[PDB]
Scaffold this active site. Sequence first.
Site, PDB file in Angstrom:
ATOM      1  N   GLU A   1       0.701 -10.789   6.853  1.00  0.00           N
ATOM      2  CA  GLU A   1       0.526 -11.047   5.405  1.00  0.00           C
ATOM      3  C   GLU A   1       1.539 -12.022   4.811  1.00  0.00           C
ATOM      4  OE1 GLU A   1      -0.149  -7.273   3.291  1.00  0.00           O
ATOM      5  OE2 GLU A   1      -1.809  -6.778   4.565  1.00  0.00           O
TER       6      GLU A   1
HETATM    7  C1  LIG Z   1       0.064  -2.467   3.095  1.00  0.00           C
HETATM    8  N1  LIG Z   1       1.268  -2.333   3.948  1.00  0.00           N
HETATM    9  C2  LIG Z   1       2.120  -1.324   3.732  1.00  0.00           C
HETATM   10  N2  LIG Z   1       1.880  -0.484   2.728  1.00  0.00           N
HETATM   11  N3  LIG Z   1       3.204  -1.214   4.520  1.00  0.00           N
HETATM   12  C3  LIG Z   1       4.232  -0.290   4.462  1.00  0.00           C
HETATM   13  O1  LIG Z   1       4.285   0.608   3.589  1.00  0.00           O
HETATM   14  N4  LIG Z   1       5.140  -0.446   5.449  1.00  0.00           N
HETATM   15  C4  LIG Z   1       6.323   0.441   5.500  1.00  0.00           C
HETATM   16  C1  LIG Z   2      -0.771  -4.913   0.166  1.00  0.00           C
HETATM   17  N1  LIG Z   2      -1.244  -5.189   1.580  1.00  0.00           N
HETATM   18  C2  LIG Z   2      -2.340  -4.578   2.022  1.00  0.00           C
HETATM   19  N2  LIG Z   2      -3.003  -3.772   1.217  1.00  0.00           N
HETATM   20  N3  LIG Z   2      -2.745  -4.778   3.263  1.00  0.00           N
HETATM   21  C3  LIG Z   2      -3.903  -4.314   3.777  1.00  0.00           C
HETATM   22  O1  LIG Z   2      -4.689  -3.647   3.084  1.00  0.00           O
HETATM   23  N4  LIG Z   2      -4.161  -4.669   5.028  1.00  0.00           N
HETATM   24  C4  LIG Z   2      -5.410  -4.137   5.539  1.00  0.00           C
END
Ligand SMILES: CNC(=N)NC(=O)NC
Ligand SMILES: CNC(=N)NC(=O)NC
Length: 310
Positions: A147
């Site tokens: 991301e």
């Molecule tokens: C959408 N990615 C996340 N919410 N990631 C985390 O909470 N990583 C600790």
């Molecule tokens: C804020 N980043 C995310 N919500 N990421 C994802 O949903 N990855 C599937």
Amino acid sequence: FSNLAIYWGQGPNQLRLSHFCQETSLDIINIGFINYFPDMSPGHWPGSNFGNQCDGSVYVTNDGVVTKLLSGCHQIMEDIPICQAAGKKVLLSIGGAYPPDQSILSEDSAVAFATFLWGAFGPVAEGWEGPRPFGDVVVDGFDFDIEHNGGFGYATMVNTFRQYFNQVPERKFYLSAAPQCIIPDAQLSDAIFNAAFDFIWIQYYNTAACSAKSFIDTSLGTFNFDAWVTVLKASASKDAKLYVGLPASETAANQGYYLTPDEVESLVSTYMDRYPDTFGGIMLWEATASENNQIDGAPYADHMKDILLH
Ligand SMILES: CNC(=N)NC(=O)NC
Ligand SMILES: CNC(=N)NC(=O)NC
Ligand SMILES: [Cl-]
């Protein structure tokens, strides 16, 4: 016949994986995340985070370097095979949102990052001598939820995994990607163009210019699934199935990106009709948001499946 993928692992006070293993409507569960990459993390090992699942113990290497790889994830180890005996595919997800400062610095480290994950979470190998964080579990493959910080090195990881998959001909393994709308996608367009993914779930929330909601209200942005089909058909990912990624409740993403089952039906019915051999189904962010969004006695994801089946 079209599939439902869901992310699990980052839900606040989440139920354990086995609760979702028992929800029949789920086809694919992506487990997040391996969120520390080797170039910037202790020992050049990747690191992991699974919310309230593992105990918080990390591996320490033979050298006595304290890593960020969780070593006490006993509930996930028990649960993954349950999901797999229910016929679901369990994929281990790389990246996610936090922290926002990870990437791959060299092709060498891209090769070692995939080789590490394959040794650690793939089939048990004779010459392997690193961790086995889920023990004898063998995940069904890997998800690229990059991301931040550009797209370097991921095509090479994907191509590397595939070379490894081929050494194990009796089982089919899987590679997937979770890009955002804004395309090209800074993190994943190159991987998508230059390597073969099995599944690509476009996240259609959090970006106003091309969101799923812009499908319902065409003044918000322009829903761009058509362009994505065109890109895919010229890519090394031309055989991928393309899924629409949605928030599983109002608060799973920023305000205004959640669609009601009725809106979801409109979108999905158009795109499944328009692209019957490319459209894959729905991906949902995420399991706990879906569990907590109960509509008429059933979680959001059960309703998504019903939509896909009709
Ligand atoms: C959408 N990615 C996340 N919410 N990631 C985390 O909470 N990583 C600790
Ligand atoms: C804020 N980043 C995310 N919500 N990421 C994802 O949903 N990855 C599937
Ligand atoms: Cl539980």
